[PDB]
Each structure stands twice: as structure tokens, then as C-alpha cells.
Amino acid sequence: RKGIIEGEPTCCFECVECPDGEYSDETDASACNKCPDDFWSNENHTSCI
Amino acid sequence: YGPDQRAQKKGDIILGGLFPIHFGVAAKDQDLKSRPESVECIRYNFRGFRWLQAMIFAIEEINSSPALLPNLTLGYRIFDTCNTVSKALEATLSFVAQNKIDSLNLCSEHIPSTIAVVGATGSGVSTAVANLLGLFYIPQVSYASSSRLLSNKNQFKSFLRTIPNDEHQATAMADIIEYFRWNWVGTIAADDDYGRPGIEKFREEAEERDICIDFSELISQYSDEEEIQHVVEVIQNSTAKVIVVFSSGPDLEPLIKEIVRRNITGKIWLASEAWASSSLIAMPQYFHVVGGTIGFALKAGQIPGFREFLKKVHPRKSVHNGFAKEFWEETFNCHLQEFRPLCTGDENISSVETPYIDYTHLRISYNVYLAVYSIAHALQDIYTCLPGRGLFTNGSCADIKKVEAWQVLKHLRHLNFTNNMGEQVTFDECGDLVGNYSIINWHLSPEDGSIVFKEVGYYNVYAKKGERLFINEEKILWSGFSREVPFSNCSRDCLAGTRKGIIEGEPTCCFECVECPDGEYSDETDASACNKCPDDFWSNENHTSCI
Amino acid sequence: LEATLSFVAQNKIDSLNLDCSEHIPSTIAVVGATGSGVSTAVANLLGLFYIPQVSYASSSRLLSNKNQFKSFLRTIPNDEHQATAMADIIEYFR
Amino acid sequence: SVETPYIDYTHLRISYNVYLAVYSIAHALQDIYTCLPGRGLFTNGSCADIKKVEAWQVLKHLRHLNFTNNMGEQVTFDECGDLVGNYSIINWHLSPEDG
Ligand SMILES: *[C@@H]1O[C@H](CO)[C@@H](O[C@@H]2O[C@H](CO)[C@@H](O)[C@H](O)[C@H]2NC(C)=O)[C@H](O)[C@H]1NC(C)=O
Ligand SMILES: *[C@@H]1O[C@H](CO)[C@@H](O[C@@H]2O[C@H](CO)[C@@H](O)[C@H](O)[C@H]2NC(C)=O)[C@H](O)[C@H]1NC(C)=O
Ligand SMILES: *[C@@H]1O[C@H](CO)[C@@H](O[C@@H]2O[C@H](CO)[C@@H](O)[C@H](O)[C@H]2NC(C)=O)[C@H](O)[C@H]1NC(C)=O
Ligand SMILES: N[C@@H](Cc1c[nH]c2ccccc12)C(=O)O
Ligand SMILES: N[C@@H](Cc1c[nH]c2ccccc12)C(=O)O
Ligand SMILES: *[C@@H]1O[C@H](CO)[C@@H](O)[C@H](O)[C@H]1NC(C)=O
Ligand SMILES: *[C@@H]1O[C@H](CO)[C@@H](O)[C@H](O)[C@H]1NC(C)=O
Ligand SMILES: [Ca+2]
Ligand SMILES: [Ca+2]
Ligand SMILES: [Ca+2]
DSSP: OEEOOTTSOTTOOEEOOOOTTEEOOSSSOSSOEEOOTTOOBOSSTTSBO | OOOSSOEEEOOSEEEEEEEOSBSOBOOOOOOOSSOOOOOOBOSBOHHHHHHHHHHHHHHHHHHTOTTSSTTOOEEEEEEEOTTOHHHHHHHHHHHTHHHHHHHHTOOOSOOOOEEEEEOOSSHHHHHHHHHHHTTTTOOEEESSOOOGGGGOTTTOTTEEESSOOSHHHHHHHHHHHHHTTOOEEEEEEESSTTHHHHHHHHHHHHHHTTOEEEEEEEEOTTOOHHHHHHHHHHHHTOOOOEEEEEOOHHHHHHHHHHHHHHTOOOOEEEEOTTTTTOTTTOOGGGHHHHTTOEEEEOOOBOOTTHHHHHTTOOTTTOSSBSSHHHHHHHHHTOBOOOOOOBOOSOOOTTSSOOTTTOOSOBSHHHHHHHHHHHHHHHHHHHHTOOTTOOSSTTSOOOOSTTOOHHHHHHHHHTOOEEOTTSOEEOOOTTSOOOOOEEEEEEEEOSSSOSEEEEEEEEEOSSSOTTSOEEEOGGGOOSSSSOOSOOOOOSSOOOOTTEEEOOOTTSOTTOOOEEEOOTTEEOOSSSOSSOEEOOTTOOBOTTSSSBO | OHHHHTTTHHHHHHHHOOOOOSOOOOOOOEEOOSSHHHHHHHHHHHTTTTOOEEESSOOOGGGGOTTTOTTEEESSOOSHHHHHHHHHHHHHTO | OOOOTTTOOSOOSSHHHHHHHHHHHHHHHHHHHTOOTTOOSSGGGOOOOGGGOOHHHHHHHHHTOEEEOTTSOEEEOOTTSOOOOOOOOOOOOOOTTTO
């Protein structure tokens, strides 16, 4: 997940790992999506199981 | 040889002048079915006629003083430019006739010569005039042109000015925006040599200061309906309340009229000194749009007996002045006999309110005054030199009887004298002066009902960076009636329990608020990331602090 | 500017009414300069006498204003397309 | 025997614009030359005299110019006095035989 660097333009950022119950399945994604009601994320938060 | 109407007097040394007695030329379309003819100037400028009288007053004051340039006489040759390049170019070609005759080797054989010219008002007109005046090394002293492109001495070899350039105004506007804690603004500039470099300088400074600019548009005096409507649509589609305008009254009036007719209110205008005191924009009918403007003003000077000289103008006594006839006719709305009524000729000029004598401070007239005295004192320095102490090859002195233009320019380059206000006047290596700035606010008069300019601070250029700006906030009305500072940020501040977010395709000034995960906390009012909790500790439910 | 002042000698003499040589050729048109800064300075003087000027290298967009430059013509495109093409090239290679 | 950019070139790009600039004026003068009465661009359809032509008449004829060059294409100026033209993209290499 993209992270803000203060005092710098938008083209320069940093990456942060998504939380335990959320996932990110793209590249250069600015947010982590939540799994559905009866789904939980796996070890790499790249998909819901 | 030259234009028809002019102000002229005879003397041993002749000075030239260019003043905008008219606001512009007729908006005619050019078709070449027949031979083109002279274009006409349309709108009268009462303020520009007062600037002309300052030069004549200064010359007559020098000619009557035995202590300055004794036994010599100063003449003048003043033309009208109508803030257009072509008229000024015709006048300049009238100025340099004698030098050009020998330059081209192409009759009269006896014509008066000009040693110096008091410059123009606009920066483009000044550039065009200087390009031709520097060919023959004729010095030119300007009183209102402040473009930073005119400081280049490789191209403008004989240009001097008695006004500071436009770097400090851009820096001061950035300082004001930083002072009032705004980070979301828009910009509008005039498409000429005055607005573009100034707005570019403002753009650079602000970026260094982490200020986001939403839109940037260019305008002109001869813009059509489509461009004006596009600019108006751009403005009202934005959520930025503060707009910085680098331009003049003639170049800004159409956009202001179009905005006024649409009733667009709630904007905060930052004004440059070109239109911060203009009477074309400071109208009572526009106060619900432009009320509460903050702008810059130059320093004021004192001329002890200027108003008495101003009040003595007459169309039948001013033989040497050719603009007084039209001044009288425009002032009293009558026709002078060689359907308006015939002018009686004994009508007081105090009855009719015009910018001619309805002023509070002398700012540009003082610049004209100083421009005349600079040339006078350079001539005096030429006159009172001794052999072996000259500035020329072997210490020689130029002859006062046979003086030449380049010698006067050389002596102007080394000028150092005191004025009637007790201060010193020297031009730097770029031919520039330094001066303070004043900050004004647009109010509404309770009794008269007109617009009143009120000073609320100043800008000090002789101080160091970061301590130049002074503002007294208790004297500011933010729209003519309000007492609270407006909000002009892109988005609200994220609270202490959240952090910042990224919006795709948008600048850094606009963000979202996202809560902190369990086991983390933040304690700032704008947090890029949610900080973790120390070992053997856990975050509170609100994630405000660890427990 | 020195070379241009000799192009408009007869017209300038007629305009100022100063009036000698009795034989001065008149220039119909001028093949413009190379740089844009020189072209503007030359056009400011030529447009006074409505003398056409055709430039071959100047490509600034400031010369497209017909309120200021009445008799200026070009055989080369201006630079707006060039700037757009540079932006397109930068976007193409990511 | 001496290598100078005078005759060391592969294409004519800017020197071709001067050629076209001269032919533009020449064709404007030619169009002045063959003006039949009643079909002029001036007042009441009158034409100008080629023996006593003036600069503003040539400017008026230049503003309404539409002719063909030696390559078969059309040449005409827009309302701003400009033209339209294709661009070419090039890359800087090194000659192995010479350097
Ligand atoms: C609008 O944005 C500006 C720019 O960040 C804010 O000003 C900053 O406020 C923080 C909070 O105390 C200060 O630490 C910074 O020093 C300020 N920056 C500057 C340049 O002054 C301002 O607080 C925001 N205002 C609102 C109402 O959100
Ligand atoms: C520009 O403005 C500053 C501030 O108003 C002037 O500095 C003041 O000068 C007066 C005159 O001696 C002093 O009484 C004040 O104490 C000064 N104030 C400060 C903050 O230093 C400065 O003189 C002005 N510059 C010019 C050229 O007039
Ligand atoms: C350099 O930056 C650009 C982003 O500006 C990256 O280009 C994007 O790549 C993704 C994945 O292939 C595409 O889905 C986007 O459409 C691209 N954006 C653009 C502008 O087309 C690019 O991958 C980066 N290059 C490297 C090697 O990191
Ligand atoms: N400084 C302006 C000229 C100017 C100053 N004050 C003005 C008042 C009215 C009109 C023009 C002006 C410029 O360089 O162009
Ligand atoms: N056309 C350029 C100048 C230019 C083009 N080709 C050149 C070759 C050499 C020197 C200058 C040039 C301009 O607008 O100013
Ligand atoms: C001008 O003269 C004054 C004293 O008359 C002096 O203080 C000042 O430094 C001089 N100016 C310069 C630039 O040296
Ligand atoms: C110019 O001439 C060509 C050929 O006669 C013609 O097709 C064209 O319409 C004319 N006008 C323009 C603007 O090309
Ligand atoms: Ca920064
Ligand atoms: Ca005297
Ligand atoms: Ca964008």
C-alpha cells in the first residue's frame, strides 16, 4: 500500500504492508481492501480465502 | 516633424517624455481594401495628465533656481503613447532623427537634439522604446516599468528606472500566503512582459513554500467573449478562495465586469500595485465582488507646491501645453469654439470630481519628479567638474556647451545626490532603485459611499529573510464586513486518531483520513503514518495514545 | 535594427515630413530573421509602414498575435505542437 | 577539398524554407500581375498597378495566397500567418568508419 512522504510530490512514495484482515491484489495500489463478510486473508495479503 | 498635439518649449537642453494621456486605441479591424490611416485613441486618462504636469513643474522649478544649473534653460518635447507600441515608436523615431541621419548617411541640416528621455509606463512599451534608444546611447529613465527583463544590461545598454523591480512583490505575496496559512490558491496574469515573469517568479517561490496552485490563466485587454467565458468557468469550477492577480486595470476590466454580472462572491483577491489603486476596478458597483481586496502600494513623497500649480491650468493660458484643450473639454463636457454647449472659459476645476486633484498620496508623480532631478543633477555634475578630476580617459571634462548623450549616461551611472526628503538616490549596476512597500485594504466609506484604501501593514526590503512582513490583523475586513480569516485549504486536517491518505491524480495538498490499526497510535494533527506501540504496550480504543 | 532602419528610409522620411538624396529604393517585402527575439524587434518597426515580412526559422507563439504584429508571416510551424509531442514522447516510454 | 557545413549535408530543411518564402512573394506579385478588371480585392473590385505597386497591396495579396510548390503540394497561410507541418524524430549514432 502506498505511503505519503511529507514535503515531496506525489510521484515519490513508500510501500506499507496491508493489515492482517485486508488484502491488496494490484500494483501501485493506494489502499488495502477488506475481505468479504465470511472471508479472511491468507499469509501474503494478496487474496481472500 | 512628429505627432500633431504635444507639449513643447525651447531651451539649450531638451528633454523628451512619454505619458499615457489615453487608455488605448480604437478597436478597429484591419482590412486592406484602401490605404491604412492613423488610428485614434479613445478613452481619456486623467491620472496620466497629472503625471505629465509633474515633469513640467520640475523643469520650471529647476529653471527658476540659481543654485542648480545657472544660466542654462531646459526645454521639453512630450508626446502621448496611448499605452501602444506604435505611437511610442513614432515618437521615438521623432526623437532620434538627428543621430539616425548620420547613422544612415541619408533636408533640414539643423534640428534640436535630445539628450535624455523620461521613460514610459508599460514594460512592453519600455522594451520597444529602449531597443531603439540604445542604438544611439541615449539614456532613458522610467518611472513605472518594473519588469525584471529590463535589468539585462547586455541588451538594454542605457535603461534606468526609479522604481524597484517585481521580485520582491512576488516574494511578499508568497510570504503573505504563508503567513495566513493557506495552501490552495489560483493565479491569473496579464499576457505581456509585466505579468508573465512576475507570475513565474511567484510560482517558483510558492513551491519552495509547499503551496499548491490549482489553476493558472492568462488574460488581455483585447480578449474576446470565448476566452473570458472560459476563464470564468475555470474560476467557478474550483474550490480555492484566494486568487493572486498580476496585471493592470485595462487588462483586468473585462474579466471583472463579466464576473460582476454573474454575481460571483466570496473570493479573496491579492492585488499587485498596478491595479491595487486603479479607479477602473475600484467602483462602488463592484464592491460585492472585489470588496476586501489586499494589495501593494508604493511609498509616498511630498511636493510642496504641486496642487497650486495643478489648479492653475487653463485652455487659453497654457500656450506650450497641447493637451489642456482636450483636458478642459473632457472635464467639463463642453466644446471649445475655434451638440455640446460652448465652454464659457471661467469654470472652476474644483467643482468636478476627477482623479486630477482627487488624490491622497503622490507615488508615481514623485517618481517623475525624481526622474527629472536625476538628469538635472547629472548635468550639474558635468557642469561643476575640474580638470584632472573627470571620469573620462585622462580625467578630462566634457563641455557643458557641447554636451553629448553618452556623457550624460556615463555621469548618470555614477550619480549620488540627496533629494528634498533628505534621502540619498543612487542607481545600482543594473540601474535600479530599492524601496519599501505598503499594504492596503479596500473598505467602504460610511458617509460618501466610495471605496477607501486603508493601510494595514508594510513590507521591509532592507531587513533579512523571514522578518520583512508586518500585518495588523485587527484593521482588516475580509469582505468589507467580516472579521474572521477565511478557510482556503484543499481538505480538512486529519485528527489525532487517524492518518493521511492518497487520492489518485491529485496533488499532495488534498488527502483523506484513515484510522489507525489496532496496536498502533498517532499523536499529531497531520500524520503521514500511524506509529506503532512500544513493546508490552497496547493502543487505546480511540488510538490516541498507548496503554 | 540598424539594417532595418535602412529598409524604411523613404517611408520614414515621408511620414516625418522632414525630407535630400532624391534616389532611395523602396523595399516591398523582407525575408525575416532567424531568432524569435530578433524577429519581434524587426516586426515592431516594419509593421509601422505595413511592409510584409516572411520568416523562415522563427517559431515562437508570441508572434501569432495580430493586434501587435500586423504584417508577419511564417513558413515554419510554431512550437505548441513540439511541446505536445515532447509530452507524448515522455508518456509513451512511461 | 575542405569539409565544411557549406556542402556537407544530407537534407535541405531550413534552406528549403527560404526558397518557399521567395516563391510566396513571387506568386503574390504574379497574382497582382494578372488581375482582370472587376475581380480585384480592393474597393469596388479594382486592381493595383504592377508598375507602381505598394507594400500594403502585396500584404493583402499575401493574406489571400493559395498556390502549389515544385513538389506538388499546396501552400497557403492561415488567419494567423502560420503553417502546419509534419515532424521527424531522430537519434544520435556514431559512424564506425569515420567516428
Ligand atoms: C491549512 O494548511 C496549512 C498548511 O499545512 C496548515 O498550516 C500548518 O499547520 C500546522 C498545524 O499546527 C503547523 O504545524 C504548520 O507549521 C502549518 N504550516 C504553515 C506553512 O503555516 C493549516 O493549519 C491548515 N488550516 C486548516 C484550517 O486546515
Ligand atoms: C522601510 O520601512 C522600515 C520599517 O517601517 C523603516 O525602518 C524604520 O525606520 C524608522 C526611521 O528611522 C525607525 O524609526 C523605525 O524604528 C524603523 N523600523 C524598523 C522595524 O527598523 C525603513 O527606514 C524604511 N526604509 C526607507 C528607505 O524608508
Ligand atoms: C515508471 O512509472 C510508470 C507510472 O508513471 C509506470 O507505468 C505504469 O505501469 C503500470 C504497470 O505496467 C501500468 O498499468 C500503467 O498504465 C503505467 N502507467 C503509465 C504512465 O502508462 C512504470 O511501470 C514505471 N516503470 C518502472 C520500470 O517502474
Ligand atoms: N508597473 C506597471 C505600470 C504601472 C504602474 N502603475 C500603473 C497604474 C496604471 C497603469 C499602469 C501602471 C508595468 O510595468 O507595466
Ligand atoms: N527557430 C528558432 C531558431 C533556430 C532554428 N534553427 C536554428 C539554427 C541555428 C540557430 C538558430 C536556429 C527560434 O525560434 O528562435
Ligand atoms: C553617496 O554619498 C553618501 C554621502 O554623501 C554616502 O554615504 C553613500 O555611501 C554614497 N553612495 C554610495 C553608493 O557610495
Ligand atoms: C486552394 O487551391 C486548391 C486547388 O485549386 C483548392 O482545392 C483549395 O480549396 C484552395 N483553398 C485552400 C484553402 O486550400
Ligand atoms: Ca517540498
Ligand atoms: Ca537654473
Ligand atoms: Ca492532474
